[PDB]
């Protein structure tokens, strides 16, 4: 098993004795002060924690599947000078079909890693939808300057 | 060593054991009477043969 040992080397280089630090409180003391003899007293050895015994997950009473179909696959998007914001609320959002699929050329997320999006739980989601020229996609980022 | 520095090495060709030591370094101190007195100084090389 993986344990911690302390080994004693004599003048010729041979191991003559050893202690196992995980066996006893006394062996842990001998490993902490690095000696085979201990004086009388009280020595602060280590720190202790208590490991957990269970798991608790609490999410609310939401059942409706989330309409990601209407936002992405829609007949008409408005032009960039008059974009539209749509509010999404009270849904269970899978989020895996966005990064598993090869549909999207740029999937760039700021402040959240995409893989952790399926665990987090939000208040509302707002989707802003518009259409831009091919080189104007780079200007959709925080703190960037251009006409768009 | 006790400080986990390499102190001994076995020669690969001859299987001879040999010791590595650091070649000398240290501090250099200058002993002077004073600029107004004289421009001669003495030099102390600390802890070296």
């Amino acid at each position: 098993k993986p344990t911690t040992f302390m080994l004693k080397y004599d003048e010729n280089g041979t191991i003559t004795d050893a202690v196992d630090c995980s066996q006893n409180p006394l062996a842990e003391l001998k490993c902490s002060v690095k000696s085979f003899e201990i004086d009388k007293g009280i020595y602060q050895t280590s720190n202790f924690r208590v490991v957990p015994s269970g798991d608790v997950v609490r999410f609310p009473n939401i059942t409706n599947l989330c309409p990601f179909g209407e936002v992405f696959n829609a007949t008409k998007f408005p032009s960039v000078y008059a974009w539209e914001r749509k509010k999404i609320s009270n849904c269970v959002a899978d989020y895996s079909v966005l990064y598993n699929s090869t549909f999207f050329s740029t999937f760039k997320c700021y402040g959240v890693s995409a893989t952790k999006l399926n665990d987090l739980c939000f208040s509302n989601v707002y989707a802003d939808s518009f259409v831009v020229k091919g080189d104007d996609v780079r200007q959709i980022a925080p703190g960037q300057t251009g006409v768009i | 060593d006790v400080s986990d520095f390499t102190d001994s090495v076995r020669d690969p060709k001859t299987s001879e054991i040999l010791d590595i030591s650091p070649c000398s370094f240290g501090g250099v101190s200058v002993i002077t009477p004073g600029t107004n007195a004289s421009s001669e100084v003495a030099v102390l090389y600390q802890d070296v043969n």
């Binding site: 098993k1 993986p2 344990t3 911690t4 040992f5 302390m6 080994l7 004693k8 080397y9 004599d10 003048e11 010729n12 280089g13 191991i15 050893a18 196992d20 630090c21 490993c31 690095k34 000696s35 085979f36 | 006790v2 001994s8």
Partner: peptide, 30 residues
């Protein structure tokens, strides 16, 4: 049957030669 292995199974951990030390190591040990 089952028995006890008291202070047995220690080995030289590595290639290093050391003398007059108490050396702490973490490795697979009995």
């Amino acid at each position: 049957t089952q028995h006890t292995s008291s202070m047995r199974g220690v080995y030289y951990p590595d290639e290093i030669f050391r003398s007059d030390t108490l050396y702490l190591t973490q490795d697979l040990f009995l």
